[PDB]
UniProtKB/Swiss-Prot annotation:
Recorded name of the encoding gene: glcB
Modified residues (Cysteine sulfenic acid (-SOH)): 607
Reactions the enzyme catalyzes: glyoxylate + acetyl-CoA + H2O = (S)-malate + CoA + H(+)
The enzyme's E.C. designation: 2.3.3.9
Annotated family: Belongs to the malate synthase family. GlcB subfamily.
Regulation: By bromopyruvate, oxalate, and phosphoenolpyruvate. Malate inhibits the activity to 50% at 1 mM concentration. Glycolate inhibits only at fairly high concentrations.
Residues binding acetyl-CoA, per UniProt: 117, 124-128, 274, 302, 531, 606-609, 621
Co-factor: note: Mg(2+). Mn(2+) is able to replace Mg(2+).
The keyword Isomerase is assigned to this record: no
Binding positions for glyoxylate per the UniProt entry: 329, 422, 447-450
Listed cofactors: Mg(2+); Mn(2+)
UniProt protein name: Malate synthase G
Role description: Involved in the glycolate utilization. Catalyzes the condensation and subsequent hydrolysis of acetyl-coenzyme A (acetyl-CoA) and glyoxylate to form malate and CoA.
UniProt keywords, alphabetically: Cytoplasm, Glyoxylate bypass, Magnesium, Metal-binding, Oxidation, Transferase, Tricarboxylic acid cycle
Amino acid sequence: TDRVSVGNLRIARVLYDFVNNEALPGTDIDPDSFWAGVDKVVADLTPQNQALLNARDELQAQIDKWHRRRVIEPIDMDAYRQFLTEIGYLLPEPDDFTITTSGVDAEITTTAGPQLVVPVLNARFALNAANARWGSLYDALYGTDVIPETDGAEKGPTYNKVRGDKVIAYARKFLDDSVPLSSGSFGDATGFTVQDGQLVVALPDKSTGLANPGQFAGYTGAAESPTSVLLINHGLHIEILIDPESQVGTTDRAGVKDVILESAITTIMDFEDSVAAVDAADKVLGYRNWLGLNKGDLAALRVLNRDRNYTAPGGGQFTLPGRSLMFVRNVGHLMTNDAIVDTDGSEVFEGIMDALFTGLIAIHGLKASDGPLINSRTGSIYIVKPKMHGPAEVAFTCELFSRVEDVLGLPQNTMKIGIMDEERRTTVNLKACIKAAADRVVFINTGFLDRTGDEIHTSMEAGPMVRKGTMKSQPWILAYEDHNVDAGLAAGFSGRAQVGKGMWTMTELMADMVETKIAQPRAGASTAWVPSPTAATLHALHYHQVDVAAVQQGLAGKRRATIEQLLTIPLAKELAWAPDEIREEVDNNCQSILGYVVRWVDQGVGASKVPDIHDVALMEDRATLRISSQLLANWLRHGVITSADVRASLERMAPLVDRQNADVAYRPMAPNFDDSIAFLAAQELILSGAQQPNGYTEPILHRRRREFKARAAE
Ligand SMILES: O=C(O)C(=O)CC(=O)c1ccccc1
Ligand SMILES: [Mg+2]
Ligand SMILES: [Mg+2]
Ligand SMILES: [Mg+2]
């Protein structure tokens, strides 16, 4: 029956073999003790994990009933707040405290910069992400719409010199703004030299040094004519590559070939929202990539970068990390996976399993590769825990990590937690959530997409919600973002932990990203999420413009969001929409859902670029699916749309998704809709949306992907 018996557990053979043959060797952990530890942790923690999921369902049923029992008209906020407090949703705020987390890397406690999130099941993307610590500014500007494709500056099959000159000019202006010269502009530089340990820049008429000579961090090659100059601004490195022999350098006034930016400071290897892993075979593929990353031998030959060698201004030698500091995002408390079943045939909680397996694998990252150890030099394992609801759930994750550390023979508190603030019950009790993880917390981050999905589901019974596009400007979300920064700064996060903000999803709109995303470090966020190594390089420009440490100091002690603002439900006003607007929102949500779901169910791809109704390429994950499906479920629940409208929109958008795809492994949905597991999954997400726990998409997606693989097997 392809399973291995260990106590009360029945382990899929592929997982048992992977752990024994690949994960355990080199950790000095006894295989028999590891497996007995897995059995004991699962048996001991499964009841509290179930109790917490039951408490979520109970609180939601109480809120749903409360909204149906409203006669009013404008919601009575005082009565709503009193009700949430009585049911235990809204808990008392604890007294002021400071976090005690220790042994954390400088990339987290001090450096403000981009954070890249990548699906761990894609080895090529995981490799590029780990390597994205250093990225080419010239490649990021040339290859994207940051430099407009106006008449003359368009991209073609070959290098366009007019476009190349615009890239060079943009980078020279970046240098002037970031590392200013004492006199003149970098645009007029003819050369660079290191004289008496000082950077000397040659201008046509004179020579100049830096306005702040401390911004000179080092160089490569000879001091008289360096091969590169290393600068530092706001704790982020900038490297000017000097090579007059190169095609670009030949055309350049100072022979500059490229400007390299320290870009993705940290990377999150994702096992959650951006991947589709429904059984042991899928989990092993992910665990094996995570293992290859920690051992430093993952290779696609594309391999992991080594540290970078530099000469200090004075002449001595030093090194800088060549790779992004890695976190792993485990799944949350909800799902079970049949990778492990108990004697009764009951599936084991996936979050428990992820803590054991990703934690075990992370041990390899704390020791010498095959040279130096890949990841944490300070001895920490960085785990992001998503979708937690309130401080009892955070307390549970901390107990699970403590129990895992005991099984792995690791010091207590080795396993650090990146808290996602992406559920309403966490937002409203944020201070108590940080306190419950006070000795393990390394970040708080506003996962705004899941947070929007939770906002829709929680108040599902209150009335029809505003359009998806209107959500970003609603009072609740603006208060949520500010409250997050306030709670983190009040808990002493400055100099100790990251205060993070969300994902930019418009992958092709890089000019818009460079214009807009600056709002996040201006709001005191020490990091924000980016979808690609190119977006990391461009978002790094924002941290050179904004002094995040100064912004945070200025925000100290402010309380900019009240509990009433956090609780403002995003209900639409009566008569808000004309028929064309309703139809556009329905079609847009159906296209987004079908586009994403078809690749999830039929191909096991958890993150896809899906063009929306306005032909804008959007990076879709489970969280964007949670919003779209919950919004349509909400509109169907309150009579904004009929069941005939939903079906007709799904059938209309299905051939358009089929066209956008084929591909090669692609199976079209139209015309035999009822024979398409992917189409039926999309339909179920909408029609059963109101009945999914907290509006989560995994139960349906996992069930439908498992059904697709079964049909393909027979
Ligand atoms: O906002 C949220 O809930 C995050 O958890 C976002 C997220 O996972 C993501 C990852 C890759 C692509 C698009 C969104
Ligand atoms: Mg109900
Ligand atoms: Mg999320
Ligand atoms: Mg400054």
